[PDB]
Design a protein around this ligand. Structure first.
Ligand SMILES: NC(=O)c1ccc[n+]([C@@H]2O[C@H](COP(=O)([O-])OP(=O)(O)OC[C@H]3O[C@@H](n4cnc5c(N)ncnc54)[C@H](OP(=O)(O)O)[C@@H]3O)[C@@H](O)[C@H]2O)c1
Ligand SMILES: NC(=O)c1ccc[n+]([C@@H]2O[C@H](COP(=O)([O-])OP(=O)(O)OC[C@H]3O[C@@H](n4cnc5c(N)ncnc54)[C@H](OP(=O)(O)O)[C@@H]3O)[C@@H](O)[C@H]2O)c1
Ligand SMILES: NC(=O)c1ccc[n+]([C@@H]2O[C@H](COP(=O)([O-])OP(=O)(O)OC[C@H]3O[C@@H](n4cnc5c(N)ncnc54)[C@H](OP(=O)(O)O)[C@@H]3O)[C@@H](O)[C@H]2O)c1
Ligand SMILES: NC(=O)c1ccc[n+]([C@@H]2O[C@H](COP(=O)([O-])OP(=O)(O)OC[C@H]3O[C@@H](n4cnc5c(N)ncnc54)[C@H](OP(=O)(O)O)[C@@H]3O)[C@@H](O)[C@H]2O)c1
Lengths: 238, 242, 242, 242
């Protein structure tokens, strides 16, 4: 079998992705930060529906903890086949009012996590010679920019550049590297929500299960020639 | 059941897409232009593997013929749920050496086909109230441009713009409209001297061509019910070219 | 000196581009289709301000007339240094209501013009060994798609693909090929009910239309000697739409 | 009487941009990090050619120093009209071999500098009511990714997203915010073995590096009054790479 780490699997998109990939037959690393209950609830649903997984935990902003836990997991269970770097946060404010923490927490958590979580998985993935899948979670605001979120937009755009650069390095190793950029998904400021809606031709939010379908496609064996892409799932926003 | 028209289903990507969507449980309009044998061979494989379809035929550059055949098909069998506008051609030459026929055949066939094939399907799709799927075939050269193919690049980029504009009009009708942009795929369309193949590979990080079945997997994803929030997208399947 | 053909110079963006490039010191081919008065007015302002130009005329949808007039002009005056393929039209309607003429007039005029106008200018440009500039006019709707204009979006996206492909062919010849994609610009082309204008503005962060002179400033930059490393680009001038 | 801060003005692109904008008549904040001599050399050339500027210094990765120096400069001289956030570095290595410092130094310097340098300038720019210009330096590798530079690609892409988001916030304040993405430019930053240079050229249709002055011409255009409708753009100057 083939295992896939899913960060932020305790809720929302991460939970949905974990469920779907488990159903597809992947053994899931159900990761959480602090919500261990949510994580167990996710794993319970996975087991109930006939699939396999296990809990693990770390702060994606904590480089050393990430390396510790992942090296241990890999030693005990073998290399991951897939990594879904889904975990992330927002700390919105107009650019001039943005606090040091607002900026740093978003950059360290959303962008540094690429290095912190994915780096420890790469050589083992290569060593196992099964090929692989890497999927990152960006955002429409990473693609187009969004008022009130210069920090989030920056981090999410940075994830896109990281994803593309890595895709080139790992192509010859049969590891695809792609990024999913959701629009507004049902999991902020009522003012900003209204503006966001003004731009969705489909006039609805997406569901987490929809994002998971795309992840499923990208994880699948038939998607091995798709790499270096940002694929947006956003109701037509752009 | 739900039917999907697939143009250029007599070979290559169209054939592969037809096969895959049939396996997914769609009833396939296996379209061809002149290669009726190829079309039947595609339908035979569909039936052999437990699915349904039927042949139909038209020149996608021929507006009247497209409207005649499609109106007839729709009257007899009901609205298409899906349309995969896959058919296309190339007539390569450096821009200054490009003949009138080289330009017109590529624009009329690859770009005018959007209007000719898809227009007659829209109101019926809307009328049936099942929602829908529209998928066009562009190309990496439509996204980035490609030397020796100003005509192909133009037509294929034009398909992208058409697709996006239509996606906006039909979003509130639960019809998604997306475009697949393959890179280099191993079919009869590509005929390359070993020298030019080597150079082409130098630009593909995966150092291989794609297979038609791979393109079909993406079409399958886009056709699926879970992909109903994906619209207005160009999705590239190209081994990392860009 | 160096001459630049500007199509659709009888009004709007073309007129503004003609004026600006004349001021920059280029000798302007002030082209028009039917509005000869507008064209002469444009040339009068050019001469009044101490620059040079001359009138010429053709239907950019008429391949033969384009080739005839351009070959003649080139024989008499030498190769163009620059070509600004600016002329274009819109025939909007929802996709299912779009007439044959709506589709064809837009594709033939906006997209076929690339071939019809620019092809005859290429070998001579190369032959003259001065390098060169080619600038096409697309649109924000060619980049993103726009509801009510599947035809315009298609043509304008096709111009982008053509531009990019050509840019690659001509890079070694010191001829840059770029595309300008304006957003909403205040000209006769735009006729909008106050209700629709308000909505349009809601999507422009700068809450105003652009002026033709603004589009001309970008053309001016791209035409300039310092812009010789910029090629294969679509540059949008749209008040922040995207 | 309009001043523009140019970070990394002690050499390369920053030097070239400083020179050009000085010639355009802007009063230049010639910033440096450690190379004070280079910075003075830049200012000497500015003064020699009839323009104005002054030196200032800070580590763009040092938030508190940036705020201290910039608040002081703004108190003494008034708000900047323009900010060109040009300074940056690379620490290349294959992703699995990338050290903590390789990653952090590039993210902190190239991406955190957006916040560190530009935030202190914004309210004052708004308060002065002259409108304004913000220009950031990304890179082709920020747009497409580049092997050996996951860190640089990430930072440079992040600059793009920052730029675009800020452009939306400041549009109504008549401050444009754009990003320049150069391809390969001939400076001290590029240090390449002849073998790797040849390969790099294979991917540039113009088969040459750009010059810093070329990047400066584009900055000049964006700084100009006629470019007030251009905002939220990434404009690539790369010899046709993409
Ligand atoms: N919702 C949208 O509209 C939308 C749109 C575009 C992109 N996205 C992106 O998609 C991803 C998921 O979105 P979502 O709506 O599912 O978010 P969500 O429901 O708020 O869940 C966020 C997850 O991230 C985890 N997390 C927070 N801080 C962390 C840290 N320091 N280390 C590790 N994990 C941490 C949380 O952990 P615990 O709760 O387990 O402690 C939680 O599982 C995010 O990266 C988001 O930026 C969302
Ligand atoms: N192969 C690639 O590398 C590649 C890359 C990017 C995009 N694409 C695109 O993918 C699509 C399929 O290409 P392919 O490689 O599968 O090509 P192919 O094997 O040459 O298939 C061509 C198909 O298009 C049909 N066709 C051609 N002219 C037609 C007309 N005037 N009216 C109706 N149908 C017509 C053909 O019908 P008959 O055989 O019955 O004559 C045939 O089924 C094309 O649009 C192409 O531009 C291909
Ligand atoms: N205005 C906008 O909001 C906007 C936005 C994005 C893009 N654009 C593009 O900008 C370019 C110029 O726009 P504009 O607003 O200045 O247009 P305009 O004022 O409506 O002028 C149209 C120009 O194109 C010429 N023309 C029209 N049909 C022609 C044909 N068949 N053959 C030759 N010439 C023809 C006209 O010649 P006569 O005067 O001789 O008839 C006229 O000079 C167009 O390509 C347009 O698509 C405009
Ligand atoms: N060269 C290229 O091919 C290329 C291509 C794409 C993008 N770019 C981007 O263009 C910009 C300029 O590049 P360039 O090639 O001119 O680079 P360069 O010759 O290496 O010049 C670098 C400048 O950035 C400054 N700098 C570096 N670290 C700093 C810090 N911590 N705080 C403040 N200033 C710092 C340097 O200051 P001191 O010398 O005074 O220490 C110097 O003035 C960079 O952002 C670069 O990434 C360059």
């Amino acid at each position: 079998s083939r295992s896939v780490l899913v960060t932020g699997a305790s809720k929302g998109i991460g939970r949905a992705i974990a469920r779907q990939l488990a159903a597809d037959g992947f053994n899931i690393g159900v990761h959480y930060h602090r919500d261990a209950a949510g994580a167990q609830e996710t794993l319970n649903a996975i087991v109930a529906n006939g699939g396999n997984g296990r809990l693990l935990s770390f702060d994606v902003a904590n480089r050393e903890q990430c390396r510790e836990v992942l090296e241990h997991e890999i030693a005990q269970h073998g290399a991951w086949y897939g990594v879904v770097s889904n975990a992330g946060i927002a700390r919105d404010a107009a650019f001039p009012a943005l606090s040091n923490d607002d900026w740093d927490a978003v950059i360290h958590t959303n962008l540094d996590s690429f290095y912190n979580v994915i780096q420890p998985c790469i050589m083992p993935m290569i060593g196992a010679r099964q090929g692989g899948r890497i999927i990152t979670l960006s955002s429409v605001s990473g693609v187009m920019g969004n008022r009130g979120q210069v920090n989030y937009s920056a981090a999410k755009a940075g994830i896109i550049g990281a994803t593309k650069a890595l895709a080139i390095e790992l192509a010859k190793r049969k590891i695809t590297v792609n990024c999913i950029a959701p629009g507004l998904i049902d999991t902020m400021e009522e003012s900003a929500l209204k503006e966001a809606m003004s731009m969705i031709p489909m006039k609805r939010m997406g569901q987490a299960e929809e994002v998971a379908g795309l992840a499923s496609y990208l994880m699948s064996d038939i998607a091995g020639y798709v790499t270096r892409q940002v694929i947006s799932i956003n109701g037509g926003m752009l």
